[PDB]
Amino acid sequence: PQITLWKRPLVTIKIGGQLKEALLDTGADDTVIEEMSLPGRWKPKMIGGIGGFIKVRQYDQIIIEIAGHKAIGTVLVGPTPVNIIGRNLLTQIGATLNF
Amino acid sequence: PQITLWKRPLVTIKIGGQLKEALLDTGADDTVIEEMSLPGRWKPKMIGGIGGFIKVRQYDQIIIEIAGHKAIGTVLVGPTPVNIIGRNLLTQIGATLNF
Ligand SMILES: COc1ccc(S(=O)(=O)N(CC(C)C)C[C@@H](O)[C@H](Cc2ccccc2)NC(=O)O[C@H]2[C@H]3CO[C@H]4OC[C@@H]2[C@H]4C3)cc1
Numbered sequence: 001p002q003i004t005l006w007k008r009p010l011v012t013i014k015i016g017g018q019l020k021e022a023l024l025d026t027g028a029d030d031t032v033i034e035e036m037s038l039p040g041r042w043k044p045k046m047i048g049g050i051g052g053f054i055k056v057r058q059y060d061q062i063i064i065e066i067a068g069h070k071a072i073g074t075v076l077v078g079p080t081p082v083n084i085i086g087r088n089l090l091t092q093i094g095a096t097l098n099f
Numbered sequence: 100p101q102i103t104l105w106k107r108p109l110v111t112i113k114i115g116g117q118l119k120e121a122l123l124d125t126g127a128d129d130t131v132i133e134e135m136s137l138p139g140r141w142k143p144k145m146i147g148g149i150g151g152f153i154k155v156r157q158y159d160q161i162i163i164e165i166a167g168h169k170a171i172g173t174v175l176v177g178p179t180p181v182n183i184i185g186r187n188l189l190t191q192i193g194a195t196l197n198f
Pocket residue numbers: 025026027028029030031032047048049050080081082084086122124125126127128129130131146147148149150181183185
């Protein structure tokens with residue numbers, strides 16, 4: 001679709017079998033989801049934003065359904081205040097910015 | 100133009116007569132730039148990101164060129180790690196997300 005930006009670009013996602021809302025975020029390199037369990041191995045990572053850094057768990061090869069589009073990639077899980085779909089998965093659904 | 104997301108969506112902006120690089124950020128409500136001087140009065144604002152909250156200076160009706168497009172609107176100035184163009188100005192240049 002074409003999403004205007006008058007409001008936050010929130011969409012429904014499916015991850016780990018759970019339905020959530022997430023922000024399509026072109027300013028995020030990586031995808032970051034609020035605390036939840038995912039299967040498989042993970043490793044610790046530190047990521048920084050406005051305010052500073054948080055510790056997260058890095059899970060690789062996770063499948064996510066984004067606005068009904070399937071994608072696979074790394075998902076970071078930790079105390080983010082918002083679920084964020086970042087560029088590593090936006091590319092996989094063919095998302096572009098247009099002006 | 101049409102901007103894919105395999106790389107960060109960095110563009111050149113011009114503000115207070117200086118050129119800067121900034122991120123086109125659909126995940127940011129507001130535009131936030133690293134510390135610099137701007138004319139006029141400012142007002143206080145606290146904004147929250149991944150790693151907590153920061154105090155910024157809010158300047159209204161500031162002229163800023165973004166990738167060759169004129170915008171005039173609110174700019175937040177503070178200790179952000181990166182210059183971010185948020186939805187308040189992305190709508191002024193006509194930007195949409197497409198997939
Ligand atoms: C390496 O992988 C990653 C992935 C994500 C991030 S990030 O989340 O720190 N960030 C990076 C960006 C360079 C600032 C993405 C933004 O798009 C956030 C996303 C985000 C939204 C809300 C809460 C936390 C993070 N925007 C936001 O801070 O905007 C505030 C400021 C912008 O204006 C408003 O809109 C959201 C809030 C608020 C003040 C960092 C590392």
